[PDB]
Amino acid sequence: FIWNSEKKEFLGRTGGSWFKILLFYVIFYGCLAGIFIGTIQVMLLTISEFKPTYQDRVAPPGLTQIPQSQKTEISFRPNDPQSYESYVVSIVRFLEKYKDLAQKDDMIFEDCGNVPSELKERGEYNNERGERKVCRFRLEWLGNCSGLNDETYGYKDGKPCVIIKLNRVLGFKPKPPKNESLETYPVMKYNPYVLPVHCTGKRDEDKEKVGTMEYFGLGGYPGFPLQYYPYYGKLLQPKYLQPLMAVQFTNLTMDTEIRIECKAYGENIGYSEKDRFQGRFDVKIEVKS
Amino acid sequence: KERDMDELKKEVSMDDHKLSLDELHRKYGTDLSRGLTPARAAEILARDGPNALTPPPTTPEWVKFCRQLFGGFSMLLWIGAILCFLAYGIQAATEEEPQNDNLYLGVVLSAVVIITGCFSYYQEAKSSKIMESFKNMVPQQALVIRNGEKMSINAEEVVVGDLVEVKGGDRIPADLRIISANGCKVDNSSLTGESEPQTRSPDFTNENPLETRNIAFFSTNCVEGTARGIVVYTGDRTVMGRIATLASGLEGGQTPIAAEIEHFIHIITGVAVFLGVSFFILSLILEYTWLEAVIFLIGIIVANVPEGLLATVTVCLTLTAKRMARKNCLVKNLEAVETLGSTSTICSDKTGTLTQNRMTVAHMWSDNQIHEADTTENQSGVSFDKTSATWLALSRIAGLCNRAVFQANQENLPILKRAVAGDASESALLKCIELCCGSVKEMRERYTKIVEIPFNSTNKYQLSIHKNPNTAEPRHLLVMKGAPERILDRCSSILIHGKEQPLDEELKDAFQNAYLELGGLGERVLGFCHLFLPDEQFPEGFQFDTDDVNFPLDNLCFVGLISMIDPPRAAVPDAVGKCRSAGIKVIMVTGDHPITAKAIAKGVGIISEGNETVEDIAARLNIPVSQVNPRDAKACVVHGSDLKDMTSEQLDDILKYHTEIVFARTSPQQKLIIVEGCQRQGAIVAVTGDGVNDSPASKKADIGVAMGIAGSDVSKQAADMILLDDNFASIVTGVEEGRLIFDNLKKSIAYTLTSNIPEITPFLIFIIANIPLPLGTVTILCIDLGTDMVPAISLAYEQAESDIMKRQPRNPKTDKLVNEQLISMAYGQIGMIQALGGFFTYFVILAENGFLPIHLLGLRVNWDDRWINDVEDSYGQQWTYEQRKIVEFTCHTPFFVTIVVVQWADLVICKTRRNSVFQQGMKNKILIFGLFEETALAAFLSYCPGMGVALRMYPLKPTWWFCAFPYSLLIFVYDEVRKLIIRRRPGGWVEKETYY
Amino acid sequence: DPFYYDYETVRNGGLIFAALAFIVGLIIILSK
Ligand SMILES: C[C@@H]1O[C@@H](O[C@H]2C[C@@H](O)[C@]3(CO)[C@H]4[C@H](O)C[C@]5(C)[C@@H](C6=CC(=O)OC6)CC[C@]5(O)[C@@H]4CC[C@]3(O)C2)[C@H](O)[C@H](O)[C@H]1O
Ligand SMILES: *[C@@H]1O[C@H](CO)[C@@H](O[C@@H]2O[C@H](CO)[C@@H](O)[C@H](O)[C@H]2NC(C)=O)[C@H](O)[C@H]1NC(C)=O
């Protein structure tokens, strides 16, 4: 029945007219493709080259960590050099963008304050102005954690440390909580021009509290200086260096795993209970020896 | 060794019937006058088995629910479910999402199999119930004679070889060898097919025991007279029992629709494994480990499976079946609805099927003229002119001389279908007079019967004499009926228009050739005569008895003839007309006598006028019958006598070279052989039947059809469809309905099959170009089982695109349900435009949200990574997991909505295969509703609160809804011009490549 | 702020739509 492979004269199944149909499908599928690209082209006419057409999805930016772990977890032996190597290299390449000889140009780089400062507004989001300068970030701002060449350098080898970073959003201008700050634990008085961040063991119940935490920020404030905002997008600001802030855990119980959460506070900031990375942060660390 | 058993059952029977009664009883060890001894009787009764058929060997338990759960389509969904379950099992290789995905899916497939199973099951069950309600078996106790004494015992207690007496009305308890009889006419109507009651006698008549008069048969009622007989056969060993067991023992065969679906499945799974394998290879050719490649393989295959279309087909069929039932046409089985549509040959039975199996007045002789009466069950015909006085005289003769009287409870009943106690002919005549001339009650009691002579054993004249009811002349009225030649012997005067005459050979032979013409017409003729009496010679007080000649039995006044036959059912002739019109070949298969069979055949239009049999030619031309070349004969009446000596090639030839065929005098086994013979030709056969002789035939046919009332029980059990109202015209509607539901199935199928392109492609190019997954599993389900359901059903309500009863029956080999063309449309063309629409919407959403399409490539690796929370879009922004995943889910919803949008267009063009939508039009209301409910539904799932929590389906921004729009319009405009070109050029390249 | 979308209102529209769209469907199948 299906032994119709080839005979006089049809190629399996029927091979008289194969040209016609194939030609047809070539024309047809050609046209379809054309039409598709057509619609995708006009669609592409309607997106702004500067700002994305919808930002409502990234609205509460998230807090991220230097050594993004398999699942939020740094577990390592203080001794074995290969124990922490993955993390160490992650940090190494992360801050490789931040070195002082990497921001050489005064054409595209700008030296901002040594102290947190008011937001730097550059024009509008069009191209009338040139490509915007980008504010410098010197690794010295985080002391004892990547420390330039000066210490750690085990980068926590004795006791654990993680840099937290804020997610980039084009146009986003962080508003820190008012000087009427509804109980934000222990923090400096530099609320005017800094987006604050603080770390805790468990969220809002009992905790296996074991931690002493030291923070390194711009000028010493545990947060993000407003001067680096707003972000102008990859087109208007390539080589844009965003603020980094480091958190070192000095006192911790070594052979036990305890969980840490870092919250960033502000009105412009928000948290989702479904997204544990939205506005907040989670890290499980166990340093075992 | 049951093969052999059935091999002896397909062979026509034998008997001992021709024996000297001396030798008969010598063999059976019995006394002919005294029967046998009670001890002996109970000795045999418990020696074998009581007189009754072993109950139908079939009693499938409700465990037969299981049947509905498999077949072949539910098999496809089963292996699908299993594959998904295996896939998730393999996804137990890790910590894995399918808690909402693969197990969800496999369980859903299972749910569809089980639910569709339950539905179809419930339907067939319901039909079985309504059939059970028809079962009424009354015990009828047989009359035996044992030790010389007549004893009436339960019929099941009758043994082999004891004397039995049967009387007027008695049913024949078991197979008898008549030893003695008086005026005994048994009704063989359902068993052998003989229309008129056959008389039974001691004497051996025909070599074939079925036609002989010295045997009486189980399940046949004795119409009249009385007879004695020795029981030759008891229980299952009887004739009707052998038939019944053959019938129980036959095979259904695969229904045509079921086969078409099998082939359909072969196509679907074909593309399924081609895609699955080719992409398995392709996936390995890139990166993904065998694990991932296998998951993709199971993925693509399972995705190719239409879960919805099992429901939408079952519902489709059920709808058509519902209409069938509304018309009092019941289908035992669910797929049995289509079969008529595929039928190229109808083998029909004669008595009780094509005819009413009720002796009825056909033609009458008045004033040397033939007037046809109305032979229809419903009286839908033409009444004769009853004004003439000759008819009045005649009608009084027929009404007055009879033993026929209506029974106690027949008043409200229609005069025809109402019961009557009397002879065959007497019943016909009684009903006829009670109909045409008014009532026979006051009419028969008007004239008072003095002395009557019942039918004599010889000469069969029946006379009676009454007093005068008129006011003018008070002479005694004499009346007599009898066979035309005998009454012609005793008649002199003839009446015309109310005044007398003697007989002249001109009109005497006019009567002779009228009698030979009506007799030749297949009808049975009766001479009707009357004579007034010379009341001067026979005074008002004269009491004449039946001793000497009181009345001048000669020189009487011959009035006329009344002829009668069992007529076709009113609806029949037109119906056979339509079936022939639709190109179905009608073959009559009857066990009746050829002389009547041919006449009824010509009457219902199975043999058209002017078509000559071999013998008609031989007769007209005055030559030996052997001379004529059979090619010159279009029609043939095949005697069963020859049918026994016939071979395969011979019967094949008869069926091949004759257009109008009647097999007469054919045993049930031979009916089976004829059906099988039409099936050797590779054609779809439908059988229509009444009695037990159609049991093996109706079973073997691709579709059997019983008669709900005039049908017997065994053949009703054998039938795949029953006619409750006993209307033959239903057959026609049947072939129309099934012919239509074929087309609509295509449409439905096509529609659903179009959705597998825009459904499968997302997971395809997900693996290929490494973009984030455009369309999820839940969305895909909302399409397959959620939205498309109502439209895909609504398609079943589509109407005839042209006159279907015009077109020839389909060819099972050539014309297919799902064929290479359909797939070339659904997968090849329309499905593709759909897919493109979908992806377009996808890119509009992602590009608007900040991921430009070109940047979406390769992204998935990091995109699907739960722990990368800085993910660069085209604007340099950083997305977490849940954020971008919410855009992916809010990218699944618009892909789903887009599918709906393009299924609008698809549903409107799938409505019509050939006609442009501007012709056939939107008159389908369910379809409109389908569109509304569909869109409403999609809108709901997008926008209902917490659906992003439940289904990961998010509200669409309004502009989204329109991305799909031009693609739908393209689909519509495209197919419309295809269905324009096809109309304009029916050569045709578009018609050959596309029209499906 | 461009970081706010009236989803509740589009949500309301689509639903109110789904409501009419359905009951107009029902009028249609019930032609009396
Ligand atoms: C890149 C890829 O993505 C993830 O899984 C991928 C494979 C597998 O997991 C699933 C879910 O189980 C598959 C599944 O097999 C088959 C489907 C059920 C199939 C359908 C049949 C049907 O009828 O409807 C749809 C088509 C795609 C499908 O809908 C899903 C899509 C989600 C996905 O999750 C994708 C993992 O992260 C994986 O490790 C990584 O290789
Ligand atoms: C950074 O690390 C240095 C060690 O190299 C710390 O220096 C010590 O500081 C403590 C007071 O906290 C003194 O008692 C020690 O004598 C110091 N030792 C050395 C070698 O400097 C320094 O405190 C760390 N700074 C922070 C902010 O953690």
Ligand SMILES: CC(C)CCC[C@@H](C)[C@H]1CC[C@H]2[C@@H]3CC=C4C[C@@H](O)CC[C@]4(C)[C@H]3CC[C@]12C
């Ligand atoms: C000639 C006619 C019939 C239609 C041809 C198609 C082109 C010219 C038009 C018609 C439909 C249109 C699209 C439908 C609506 C979407 C959604 C919106 O968010 C951006 C614009 C966008 C992407 C449109 C771009 C241009 C489009 C593809």
Ligand SMILES: CC(C)CCC[C@@H](C)[C@H]1CC[C@H]2[C@@H]3CC=C4C[C@@H](O)CC[C@]4(C)[C@H]3CC[C@]12C
């Ligand atoms: C037959 C053809 C013309 C189909 C036309 C139906 C279109 C125009 C209908 C069907 C579904 C409808 C949408 C469903 C969702 C709502 C959300 C609401 O907040 C604003 C309008 C909006 C977005 C509707 C606009 C009109 C809509 C897209």
Ligand SMILES: *[C@@H]1O[C@H](CO)[C@@H](O)[C@H](O)[C@H]1NC(C)=O
């Ligand atoms: C907040 O209040 C403190 C005194 O409680 C004051 O010293 C400080 O300057 C205030 N800062 C702002 C921003 O108002």
Ligand SMILES: *[C@@H]1O[C@H](CO)[C@@H](O)[C@H](O)[C@H]1NC(C)=O
């Ligand atoms: C750190 O913890 C140890 C033991 O838990 C304690 O003795 C020590 O004082 C702590 N260091 C501080 C408080 O600086």
Ligand SMILES: [Mg+2]
């Ligand atoms: Mg059958």
Ligand SMILES: [Mg+2]
């Ligand atoms: Mg019959």
Ligand SMILES: [Mg+2]
């Ligand atoms: Mg599908």
